Amino acid sequence: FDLGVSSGIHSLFGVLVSFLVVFRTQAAFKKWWSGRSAVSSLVQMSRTFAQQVCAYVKDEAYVNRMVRYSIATVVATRCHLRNTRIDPAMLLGVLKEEEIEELNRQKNLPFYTAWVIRSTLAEAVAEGACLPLHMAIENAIKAIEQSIADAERLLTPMPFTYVVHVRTFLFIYLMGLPFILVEDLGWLMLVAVSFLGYLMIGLENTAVQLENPFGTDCNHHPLDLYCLEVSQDLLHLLDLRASAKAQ
Amino acid sequence: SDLNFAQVARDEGRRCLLMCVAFAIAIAHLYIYPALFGVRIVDQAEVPAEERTYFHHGWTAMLVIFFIEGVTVFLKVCSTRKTRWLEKAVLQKLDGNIGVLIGEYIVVAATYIIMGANLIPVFERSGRRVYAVRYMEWTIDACGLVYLDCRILFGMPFSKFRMLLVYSVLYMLFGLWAALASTWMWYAIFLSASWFFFGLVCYYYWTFHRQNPSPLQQFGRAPIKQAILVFVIVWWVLYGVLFMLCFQAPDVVPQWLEQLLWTGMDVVMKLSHTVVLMAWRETQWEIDAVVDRQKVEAGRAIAQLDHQRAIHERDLVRLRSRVYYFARVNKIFMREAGLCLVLCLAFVVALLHLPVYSEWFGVEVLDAEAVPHDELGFFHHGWTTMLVVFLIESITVLLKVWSTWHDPRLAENVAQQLSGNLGVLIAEYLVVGATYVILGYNLMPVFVVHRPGVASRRVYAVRYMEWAVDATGLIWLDCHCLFSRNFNEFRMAIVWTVAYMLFGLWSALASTWAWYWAFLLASWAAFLIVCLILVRFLRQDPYPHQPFGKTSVKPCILAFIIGWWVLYGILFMVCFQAPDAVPQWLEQFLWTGMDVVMKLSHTVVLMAWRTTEWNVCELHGRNSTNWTATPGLRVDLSSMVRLEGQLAQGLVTDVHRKGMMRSEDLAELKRLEESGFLQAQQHRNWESQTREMTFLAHGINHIAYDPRSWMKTLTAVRGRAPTSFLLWVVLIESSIVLALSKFFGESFDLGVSSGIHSLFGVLVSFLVVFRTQAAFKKWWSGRSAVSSLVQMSRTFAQQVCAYVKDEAYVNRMVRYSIATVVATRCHLRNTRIDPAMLLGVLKEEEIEELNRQKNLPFYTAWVIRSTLAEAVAEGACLPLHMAIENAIKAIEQSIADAERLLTPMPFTYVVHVRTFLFIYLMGLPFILVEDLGWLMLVAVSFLGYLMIGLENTAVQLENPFGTDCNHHPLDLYCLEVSQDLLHLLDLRASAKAQ
Ligand SMILES: *C/C=C(C)/C=C/C=C(C)/C=C/C1=C(C)CCCC1(C)C
């Protein structure tokens, strides 16, 4: 055989590809975390908006409109990241039907819900139904959309070049390992190459998974529970207000 | 039509498996019974050896057709798996014949193989040696044949099949029992019953003919379905005659004639059968008409969609922007007729001019019967196989024409199909056959070589000439029919291929390696440049989707071809360098097998290509998760198709569309494209179509990819990083070091050292990966900036349209916000604005006043602010104005970040890195060559590529804003924004009118 193993072709490639493959993973964990943060911030802003409205406003027909369409905004963004439309079953006791059919007739939903909210708040301010605390409300609305936009950034894939390079040289290293390992072993060379290949390739695919946090896979974020939480809280808030108003 | 894909494959499998099990068990049971039971004397298994060669020949010549079909149908099914209805069509065209044909070929080949193994000479009159398995495989073959014939011609699944099948098997087994025993002993008992059952099945055939005597709709005035039945039955008659005459007459020699007749007969019979079948199959049926009818409707519906959107847009833009604000046939034959003669004459010229220049001025001129025993047995195979293929193609064409003889209009179609391609195949086949015939029994000299080291290397003459000529054919074909090109661009490849083949020959003649390497290197060079030209031809293909229907079969073809070709060269090397490696007979066997396989594959691919719509004109012809970067941009079908039209094929992709389109519209389009490609042009124009075109034409160039796929990342070429002049320097250095270490022998004294190597390695590695992790971050920051800018613009517009009551200020503001975005996309690239991007949003004079400035976003913001002040003074604005001002402030921050991202990293940090990398690389060989040779070279090449590509990749990612394909797609964001705001104006207007 005359293997003539060489340290340069083996050790150097090893250290390089190892650096690369672990860095490409530490870079995806961060995106995962940033998505978590975005979601939490969105939820919190929604709740503050609802409280502000139900306290610093005195009418009752504007309040419903606003709160319910905020809920709709959340449910809409959970369906803008997955390129779908809405299932009425998720908006049963919060909206009337015609409103839902008018929603699904649009192209960008959160846009629409925010436009609605804003026109409604303007109506309110004109009729002196709102205390001087309105700028806070506007600012809350502004801060929701930032969260949305971050969540939307998180859908881009890493650039082509940086991935092609990594993958091809990994493939090379693996296809070259045996010719240098078989000199001193037999079947052990085989089992070792199997295990090592699994390690590396699994690292890469794990990074792929973590890259986009929003999806159906089991390691992704549970969007469907946050919506439920929000619905519960706001619909209880309406009743708190109503009771405290009747006395 | 309710078929599927799984059911058909399941049926094919089960049928062929029943065939195989029956065929094997019959022979096994006969073997078991004939030894101990009955009067069955078993001749010696060994003798003779001279008869097994014939059966081997038959074996090959049979395997060929299997391969042909098993490849063609695979091509078809894999080339149109993306369209339901073409799948329906093909799966209909092969209801149940495939499994049975495959089983037939498998069993016959297995039996003619077993003949070599010499399992049992059960032969027991005198002599007239016979073999048993022939009878079992004949049972199976005839039974499958009759099932096929009845099913196709009459459609009787279970009624006639059973009786005729049992008859066949019964009288075949009777004939077996009969011939196994002596003639006088047991002829009457069985052979008479055999003849009688033959007559019975003949009567059944005649009755079923009288029942349904209709011609095959595939054919026309052809006598088909009658000529073939007559031929088959008279052939069975001749077979029975031979059976009766073999044992009776001693005059007919049973040693060789006997052994040959059955092989010939079985082969020719099965071949006529399968060729008639393929001919009946390749004809166009009504299903194609159904599909074309489905297809045209799609273009119609598309034009309807376009008109509807046109009317809608017209009304909308009016509302918002108005109120509140026989010759051809004979020539198609004659061209091919001419080409064939050119090829023949060239081959004759070669064969005539070769030996007068060799062995008259050449050493080792004579080899007397180079090796009589081994070689001829290898060569007698090739010309036989090629003869087979020849006959197949010829009769197929003859049948096609015979079926399209009466109808003139149909004849011109096929005539045009066969143009430019048929002339090459016959020439290739016949020349290969003739050359390998010459080699079989040598009329031509053999030259040996004498050189230092070893001299037993044998060499053959003609093999090379044909190769060259041969190759050219392929070239002139594989670069013309596949990639539609004229002749002016083929010249170089032809001029260079013969060249490097001649150089390979001249080299091979002289293994002295004093001047051997010259022609070898020149040949490698010409071959390489040919490959480069070829891959360029491919990558500049105008019609890459046609005809194989949007698949990756063509590049794979090219890859297979090139790998084959370089395998030839590495074998050449392995042989002539180390003759101890090669036993020199295996070498000729391999050469022959490869020459066969290449042409087999080439012809099957051209066969499958001939029968596609692009040739046969109907409706057209020859004249989970969301990966994306634009989650807010959604497009409409009309624009997608208008775009795919206004561009060249192969620039848009599946994922390009999956990212810039909704899900429902995409599913609808997919359903609508089941029939074909859907290329069409409505030729409708508007004010918005221009804008959308101007943006998309620029935006598409950037790449979109699915990370989950591993192929399109490795095999990818386009988005890769460029390299520098350094690699060449390093290869130069290494090559001289190697040649010089060998010439200088051992006195190198490398004295490798761990400090100079390992330390430098770790340091430079750290540095180079850090310099890349530092650029990825800038890329990401730019993405963030862009998103924030877009979001702020939209919030500003909403705030304005809600918290303001006038209508002339609103327009001004919104439109100039759009202008601000389009301006910053042109401040990062140091250009000015193209009016086509601001058509329906601004008046001309405003644009000319813009382009007259130096810093544009400055100007737009100034405008906006003065306008908002005007508004506030006149009490036209609610108390919510500070929010508006703050939004304006927040836009500019985003802009400034994007502008930071144009600075380059500092000089010092880059100079240091680069120079020490260069050093490390230039030093590697002197320490590596001690333990290796050429391997040192290849390793340094690869490692250099890794490192230098890393650096250049970092360079690319450093500035994210540019034209390169890995950069950010600014032109789509602008489009998105325009759409949203111009819809917002209309929302407001409507809600104001009620
Ligand atoms: C039908 C057979 C064909 C087209 C075979 C062609 C053979 C070649 C293109 C091989 C060329 C070689 C080189 C790459 C250089 C060294 C010598 C050869 C012949 C092996």
mmCIF file of N, CA and C in Angstrom, chain B residues 277-342:
data_model
loop_
_atom_site.group_PDB
_atom_site.id
_atom_site.type_symbol
_atom_site.label_atom_id
_atom_site.label_comp_id
_atom_site.label_asym_id
_atom_site.label_seq_id
_atom_site.Cartn_x
_atom_site.Cartn_y
_atom_site.Cartn_z
ATOM 1 N N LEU B 277 -42.317 -4.543 -30.685
ATOM 2 C CA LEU B 277 -42.960 -3.948 -29.520
ATOM 3 C C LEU B 277 -42.559 -2.485 -29.355
ATOM 4 N N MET B 278 -41.254 -2.216 -29.339
ATOM 5 C CA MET B 278 -40.781 -0.847 -29.174
ATOM 6 C C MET B 278 -41.336 0.060 -30.263
ATOM 7 N N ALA B 279 -41.384 -0.430 -31.502
ATOM 8 C CA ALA B 279 -41.948 0.370 -32.583
ATOM 9 C C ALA B 279 -43.403 0.718 -32.299
ATOM 10 N N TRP B 280 -44.214 -0.288 -31.962
ATOM 11 C CA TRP B 280 -45.609 -0.020 -31.623
ATOM 12 C C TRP B 280 -45.724 0.962 -30.467
ATOM 13 N N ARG B 281 -44.724 0.994 -29.587
ATOM 14 C CA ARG B 281 -44.813 1.830 -28.396
ATOM 15 C C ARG B 281 -44.425 3.280 -28.665
ATOM 16 N N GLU B 282 -43.433 3.517 -29.525
ATOM 17 C CA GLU B 282 -42.909 4.870 -29.692
ATOM 18 C C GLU B 282 -43.850 5.782 -30.470
ATOM 19 N N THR B 283 -44.980 5.271 -30.950
ATOM 20 C CA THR B 283 -45.894 6.092 -31.730
ATOM 21 C C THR B 283 -46.755 6.962 -30.820
ATOM 22 N N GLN B 284 -47.119 8.135 -31.330
ATOM 23 C CA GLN B 284 -47.964 9.054 -30.581
ATOM 24 C C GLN B 284 -49.394 8.532 -30.512
ATOM 25 N N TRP B 285 -49.982 8.604 -29.322
ATOM 26 C CA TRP B 285 -51.344 8.166 -29.070
ATOM 27 C C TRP B 285 -52.245 9.384 -28.857
ATOM 28 N N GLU B 286 -53.508 9.122 -28.516
ATOM 29 C CA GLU B 286 -54.461 10.202 -28.276
ATOM 30 C C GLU B 286 -54.156 10.953 -26.985
ATOM 31 N N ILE B 287 -53.509 10.287 -26.027
ATOM 32 C CA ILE B 287 -53.219 10.911 -24.741
ATOM 33 C C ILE B 287 -52.433 12.204 -24.935
ATOM 34 N N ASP B 288 -51.518 12.223 -25.907
ATOM 35 C CA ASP B 288 -50.776 13.446 -26.193
ATOM 36 C C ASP B 288 -51.714 14.567 -26.628
ATOM 37 N N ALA B 289 -52.724 14.232 -27.435
ATOM 38 C CA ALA B 289 -53.715 15.227 -27.827
ATOM 39 C C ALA B 289 -54.474 15.743 -26.613
ATOM 40 N N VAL B 290 -54.898 14.831 -25.735
ATOM 41 C CA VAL B 290 -55.561 15.233 -24.496
ATOM 42 C C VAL B 290 -54.700 16.234 -23.737
ATOM 43 N N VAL B 291 -53.401 15.955 -23.645
ATOM 44 C CA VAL B 291 -52.527 16.788 -22.828
ATOM 45 C C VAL B 291 -52.337 18.159 -23.467
ATOM 46 N N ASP B 292 -52.139 18.205 -24.786
ATOM 47 C CA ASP B 292 -52.010 19.497 -25.457
ATOM 48 C C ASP B 292 -53.283 20.326 -25.305
ATOM 49 N N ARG B 293 -54.442 19.662 -25.357
ATOM 50 C CA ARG B 293 -55.701 20.356 -25.130
ATOM 51 C C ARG B 293 -55.744 20.952 -23.732
ATOM 52 N N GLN B 294 -55.350 20.170 -22.725
ATOM 53 C CA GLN B 294 -55.248 20.721 -21.377
ATOM 54 C C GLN B 294 -54.311 21.923 -21.350
ATOM 55 N N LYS B 295 -53.236 21.867 -22.134
ATOM 56 C CA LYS B 295 -52.189 22.877 -22.043
ATOM 57 C C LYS B 295 -52.671 24.234 -22.545
ATOM 58 N N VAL B 296 -53.217 24.278 -23.763
ATOM 59 C CA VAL B 296 -53.588 25.569 -24.358
ATOM 60 C C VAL B 296 -54.519 26.354 -23.430
ATOM 61 N N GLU B 297 -55.433 25.641 -22.768
ATOM 62 C CA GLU B 297 -56.370 26.271 -21.847
ATOM 63 C C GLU B 297 -55.653 27.101 -20.791
ATOM 64 N N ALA B 298 -54.439 26.699 -20.413
ATOM 65 C CA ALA B 298 -53.715 27.417 -19.371
ATOM 66 C C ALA B 298 -53.273 28.791 -19.857
ATOM 67 N N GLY B 299 -52.651 28.852 -21.036
ATOM 68 C CA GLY B 299 -52.334 30.144 -21.619
ATOM 69 C C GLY B 299 -53.556 31.029 -21.741
ATOM 70 N N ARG B 300 -54.692 30.435 -22.113
ATOM 71 C CA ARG B 300 -55.912 31.230 -22.223
ATOM 72 C C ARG B 300 -56.304 31.830 -20.873
ATOM 73 N N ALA B 301 -56.390 30.986 -19.843
ATOM 74 C CA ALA B 301 -56.718 31.475 -18.507
ATOM 75 C C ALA B 301 -55.740 32.553 -18.060
ATOM 76 N N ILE B 302 -54.475 32.424 -18.457
ATOM 77 C CA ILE B 302 -53.465 33.397 -18.058
ATOM 78 C C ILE B 302 -53.758 34.751 -18.691
ATOM 79 N N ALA B 303 -54.060 34.752 -19.990
ATOM 80 C CA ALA B 303 -54.435 36.003 -20.641
ATOM 81 C C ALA B 303 -55.660 36.618 -19.975
ATOM 82 N N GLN B 304 -56.596 35.774 -19.537
ATOM 83 C CA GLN B 304 -57.773 36.287 -18.839
ATOM 84 C C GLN B 304 -57.383 36.983 -17.539
ATOM 85 N N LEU B 305 -56.547 36.326 -16.731
ATOM 86 C CA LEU B 305 -56.046 36.948 -15.508
ATOM 87 C C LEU B 305 -55.420 38.302 -15.808
ATOM 88 N N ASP B 306 -54.600 38.354 -16.858
ATOM 89 C CA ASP B 306 -53.920 39.596 -17.210
ATOM 90 C C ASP B 306 -54.924 40.702 -17.508
ATOM 91 N N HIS B 307 -55.925 40.406 -18.339
ATOM 92 C CA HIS B 307 -56.920 41.421 -18.677
ATOM 93 C C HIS B 307 -57.673 41.896 -17.440
ATOM 94 N N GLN B 308 -58.055 40.962 -16.568
ATOM 95 C CA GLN B 308 -58.779 41.332 -15.356
ATOM 96 C C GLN B 308 -57.960 42.295 -14.506
ATOM 97 N N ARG B 309 -56.711 41.924 -14.218
ATOM 98 C CA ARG B 309 -55.847 42.812 -13.450
ATOM 99 C C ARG B 309 -55.665 44.150 -14.147
ATOM 100 N N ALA B 310 -55.623 44.156 -15.480
ATOM 101 C CA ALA B 310 -55.476 45.410 -16.210
ATOM 102 C C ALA B 310 -56.641 46.343 -15.920
ATOM 103 N N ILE B 311 -57.864 45.830 -16.056
ATOM 104 C CA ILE B 311 -59.046 46.656 -15.808
ATOM 105 C C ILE B 311 -59.042 47.166 -14.370
ATOM 106 N N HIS B 312 -58.747 46.273 -13.421
ATOM 107 C CA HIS B 312 -58.715 46.673 -12.017
ATOM 108 C C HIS B 312 -57.722 47.807 -11.791
ATOM 109 N N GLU B 313 -56.484 47.622 -12.254
ATOM 110 C CA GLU B 313 -55.459 48.648 -12.104
ATOM 111 C C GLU B 313 -55.894 49.962 -12.732
ATOM 112 N N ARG B 314 -56.491 49.906 -13.922
ATOM 113 C CA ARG B 314 -56.924 51.132 -14.582
ATOM 114 C C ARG B 314 -57.901 51.897 -13.704
ATOM 115 N N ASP B 315 -58.968 51.225 -13.268
ATOM 116 C CA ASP B 315 -59.955 51.896 -12.426
ATOM 117 C C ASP B 315 -59.306 52.463 -11.168
ATOM 118 N N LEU B 316 -58.414 51.692 -10.548
ATOM 119 C CA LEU B 316 -57.821 52.102 -9.279
ATOM 120 C C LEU B 316 -56.941 53.336 -9.449
ATOM 121 N N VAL B 317 -56.012 53.291 -10.405
ATOM 122 C CA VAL B 317 -55.110 54.417 -10.625
ATOM 123 C C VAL B 317 -55.892 55.650 -11.046
ATOM 124 N N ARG B 318 -56.961 55.466 -11.825
ATOM 125 C CA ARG B 318 -57.813 56.604 -12.142
ATOM 126 C C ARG B 318 -58.380 57.219 -10.872
ATOM 127 N N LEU B 319 -58.995 56.393 -10.025
ATOM 128 C CA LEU B 319 -59.640 56.924 -8.830
ATOM 129 C C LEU B 319 -58.648 57.676 -7.952
ATOM 130 N N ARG B 320 -57.534 57.035 -7.595
ATOM 131 C CA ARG B 320 -56.651 57.635 -6.598
ATOM 132 C C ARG B 320 -55.934 58.863 -7.149
ATOM 133 N N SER B 321 -55.406 58.772 -8.366
ATOM 134 C CA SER B 321 -54.603 59.847 -8.934
ATOM 135 C C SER B 321 -55.430 60.890 -9.679
ATOM 136 N N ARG B 322 -56.739 60.970 -9.437
ATOM 137 C CA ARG B 322 -57.601 61.900 -10.158
ATOM 138 C C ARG B 322 -58.305 62.905 -9.259
ATOM 139 N N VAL B 323 -58.990 62.444 -8.214
ATOM 140 C CA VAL B 323 -60.010 63.261 -7.565
ATOM 141 C C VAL B 323 -59.445 64.035 -6.384
ATOM 142 N N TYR B 324 -58.998 63.314 -5.360
ATOM 143 C CA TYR B 324 -58.663 63.934 -4.087
ATOM 144 C C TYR B 324 -57.219 64.406 -4.017
ATOM 145 N N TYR B 325 -56.396 64.058 -4.999
ATOM 146 C CA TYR B 325 -54.980 64.378 -4.963
ATOM 147 C C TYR B 325 -54.536 65.008 -6.280
ATOM 148 N N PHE B 326 -42.074 16.029 -52.874
ATOM 149 C CA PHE B 326 -41.314 15.405 -51.799
ATOM 150 C C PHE B 326 -39.875 15.905 -51.801
ATOM 151 N N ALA B 327 -39.667 17.102 -51.252
ATOM 152 C CA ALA B 327 -38.356 17.741 -51.246
ATOM 153 C C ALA B 327 -37.699 17.703 -49.870
ATOM 154 N N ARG B 328 -38.383 18.221 -48.847
ATOM 155 C CA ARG B 328 -37.803 18.246 -47.508
ATOM 156 C C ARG B 328 -37.408 16.847 -47.048
ATOM 157 N N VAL B 329 -38.253 15.856 -47.332
ATOM 158 C CA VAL B 329 -37.984 14.482 -46.908
ATOM 159 C C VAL B 329 -36.699 13.964 -47.549
ATOM 160 N N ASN B 330 -36.613 14.066 -48.876
ATOM 161 C CA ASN B 330 -35.455 13.532 -49.580
ATOM 162 C C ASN B 330 -34.168 14.208 -49.128
ATOM 163 N N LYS B 331 -34.222 15.500 -48.803
ATOM 164 C CA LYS B 331 -33.019 16.197 -48.354
ATOM 165 C C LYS B 331 -32.647 15.804 -46.930
ATOM 166 N N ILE B 332 -33.643 15.700 -46.047
ATOM 167 C CA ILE B 332 -33.399 15.211 -44.699
ATOM 168 C C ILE B 332 -32.728 13.851 -44.737
ATOM 169 N N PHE B 333 -32.991 13.063 -45.778
ATOM 170 C CA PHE B 333 -32.272 11.802 -45.947
ATOM 171 C C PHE B 333 -30.888 11.991 -46.572
ATOM 172 N N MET B 334 -30.784 12.871 -47.571
ATOM 173 C CA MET B 334 -29.557 12.971 -48.356
ATOM 174 C C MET B 334 -28.410 13.558 -47.543
ATOM 175 N N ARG B 335 -28.707 14.470 -46.616
ATOM 176 C CA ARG B 335 -27.637 15.018 -45.783
ATOM 177 C C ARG B 335 -26.925 13.913 -45.004
ATOM 178 N N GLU B 336 -27.701 13.075 -44.318
ATOM 179 C CA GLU B 336 -27.148 11.918 -43.622
ATOM 180 C C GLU B 336 -26.411 10.994 -44.585
ATOM 181 N N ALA B 337 -27.024 10.724 -45.743
ATOM 182 C CA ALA B 337 -26.374 9.892 -46.748
ATOM 183 C C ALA B 337 -24.982 10.416 -47.073
ATOM 184 N N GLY B 338 -24.841 11.737 -47.173
ATOM 185 C CA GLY B 338 -23.540 12.313 -47.466
ATOM 186 C C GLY B 338 -22.567 12.168 -46.314
ATOM 187 N N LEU B 339 -23.028 12.445 -45.092
ATOM 188 C CA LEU B 339 -22.133 12.386 -43.937
ATOM 189 C C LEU B 339 -21.509 11.000 -43.783
ATOM 190 N N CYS B 340 -22.310 9.953 -43.996
ATOM 191 C CA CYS B 340 -21.796 8.597 -43.818
ATOM 192 C C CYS B 340 -20.577 8.343 -44.702
ATOM 193 N N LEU B 341 -20.633 8.796 -45.957
ATOM 194 C CA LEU B 341 -19.538 8.542 -46.887
ATOM 195 C C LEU B 341 -18.275 9.278 -46.464
ATOM 196 N N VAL B 342 -18.416 10.507 -45.966
ATOM 197 C CA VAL B 342 -17.252 11.235 -45.468
ATOM 198 C C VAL B 342 -16.569 10.429 -44.374
#
